[PDB]
């Protein structure tokens, strides 16, 4: 609900997402930033300094609305790259590149006792995808995207890094095929499959990818104890077969 | 200046370097930033190039402003060491070859990236080369701040600059990192300046015999005429690597 508008000195350029997120020209510096705005306290994002995690510049309050100024990743999210190219799935080597980059960001955040809690294709941005300056970034540190949420997180149990691993594996499944491991119009059904349904064989969707079956079986395990120890271990197990 | 003082909401913690640069607690976010402050040209200080640059080896600028007539730049604080402190306290006679190729390659990339976008650093030196978590897997080489020891002759003369000026500085920096001292060392800055302008670039082999093979590399990168240097900073970084 703002275009060509001025907000805390920022000039609104485009809507980027929804907590509504605008592409905005900075009041003092000649560059474009991502401005997240509230209508009616994630300091952790400022705590993180990683080449694959979107940086926060500043936070504030303008006319009762809380705002976060952060880096703008000038490219696409993996959702759009999936729908406009690769509707049936991304090439294996490009997925290992993206998942490794995000695995590192998450492992870094985990070592500092911070969980992302919402890893999904829409939070994986790639600046200049077809350029040498190509850069993979992780952003955004009731029925939301239950498509990638780990069962223990849905149940509201005590979390660790292996919750984000599940989400990353669910994300990777989506990127390689053209759909998440559990697809249904009814969120309640998706939630129930996360909790109770055996994780599906990726080979049953894309025959060429059968070798990865035990990899997704492991990373999408119901019990966190049965997954990989770190996200890069999962990313490496992908690489080994792609 | 005063440690524990408030400047534009930032709490000053210590001076990091010198444009004096302080480690400062951010007014609103719970983290430490590098705050660069000016005393008394304003247009020049508004080289808004640094905000234009977004590279994994270039220190990020968050914001710029004016507090009681003093211009300030809020930028990332690289929690680790500069290469100066690494030389003084760990490797007084020079750093290991492989570690220097790592650092110079990382900085060469940052500079080559900035050059392709028509932007020059203009002050490459050991104190602007930071390494966060040096001894950790999270190790990260950063070039910050986008003394005549490293300045190229054309830059000292105030002539038209190109990327090859920063190359000279990077090569002079690499010489220092490898040997313990810059290519031209003298208490009198005027003498250092004169050697930059007129003196044949020294043989790195004449300081550290093991490094004789790099002689033509530094001869080339420290050339008087920019046209006689490498085309890109990574070409210089690669020529180092080949012989280390
Ligand atoms: O591919 C992208 C895209 C490009 C760059 C960024 N960058 C960028 N940088 C930094 C941070 C963020 C974000 C952070 C954040 C947090 C919560 C929700 C969304 C977001 S987006 N994004 C984000 C997307 N788009 C096409 C589809 C999209 N949609 C929604 C409107 C019409 C269709 C609009 C934009
Ligand atoms: O090893 C360091 C060091 C650590 C972190 C940073 N970080 C950091 N981050 C972000 C930006 C910057 C800089 C910006 C900038 C701009 C101009 C000149 C130098 C710099 S350094 N630095 C810079 C140094 N120090 C050792 C002692 C040194 N003493 C002795 C001699 C003088 C004072 C200063 C501190």
Detailed description of the structure:
The structure is a homodimer. By secondary structure, chain A is α+β, with helices and mostly antiparallel strands. In chain A, a hairpin with a 7-residue loop joins strand 8 (124-127) and strand 9. Chain A has a six-stranded antiparallel beta sheet, with no helix packed on it. Chain A has a three-stranded antiparallel beta sheet with strand order 7-8-9. Chain A folds into two domains: 1-72, no CATH class; 74-242, no CATH class. Chain A is built from eight helices and nine strands. Chain A has helices spanning 44-47, 78-84, 92-111, 151-154, 161-176, 187-196, 213-219, 231-241, and strands at 6-7, 10-17, 20-25, 32-37, 56-62, 65-71, 75-77, 124-127, 135-138. Helices cover 33% and strands 19% of the residues of chain A. Chain A is globular. At the A-B interface, strand 5 of A face strand 5 of B. The structure holds the ligand O=C(c1ccc(Nc2nccc(-c3cc4ccccc4s3)n2)cc1)N1CCC(N2CCCC2)CC1 (2 copies). One ligand V17 is lined by residues 15-17, 19, 21, 34, 36, 54, 70-73, 76-77, 80, 125, 139-140 of chain A. The PDB classes it as transferase. Keywords: Mtb, PSI-Biology, Protein Structure Initiative, Structural Genomics Consortium, antimicrobial protein. It forms a dimeric assembly. The entry is titled "Crystal structure of Mycobacterium tuberculosis H37Rv PknF kinase domain". Chains A, B: Non-specific serine/threonine protein kinase.
């Amino acid at each position: 609900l703002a275009e060509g508008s001025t907000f805390a000195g920022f000039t609104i350029v485009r809507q980027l997402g929804s907590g509504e997120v605008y592409l905005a020209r900075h009041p003092r510096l000649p560059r474009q930033d991502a401005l997240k705005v509230l209508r009616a306290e994630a300091d952790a994002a400022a705590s993180l300094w990683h080449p694959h995690i979107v940086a926060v510049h500043d936070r504030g309050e303008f006319d009762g609305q809380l705002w976060i100024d952060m880096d703008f990743v000038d490219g696409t999210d993996t959702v759009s790259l999936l729908r406009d190219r690769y509707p049936n799935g991304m090439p294996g080597p490009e997925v290992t590149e993206i998942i490794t980059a995000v695995a590192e960001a998450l492992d870094y955040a985990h070592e500092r006792r911070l969980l992302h809690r919402d890893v999904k294709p829409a939070n994986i941005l790639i600046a200049n995808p077809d350029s040498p300056d190509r850069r993979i970034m992780l952003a955004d540190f009731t029925v939301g995207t239950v498509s990638y949420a780990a069962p223990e997180q849905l149940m509201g149990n005590e979390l660790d890094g292996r919750a984000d691993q599940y989400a990353l594996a669910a994300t990777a499944f989506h990127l390689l095929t053209g759909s998440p491991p559990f697809q249904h119009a009814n969120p309640a059904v998706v939630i129930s499959q996360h909790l109770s349904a055996s994780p599906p064989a990726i080979g049953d969707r894309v025959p060429e990818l059968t070798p990865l079956d035990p990899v997704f079986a492991k990373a999408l395990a119901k019990q966190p104890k049965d997954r990989y120890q770190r996200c890069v271990d999962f990313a490496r197990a992908l690489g080994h077969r792609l």
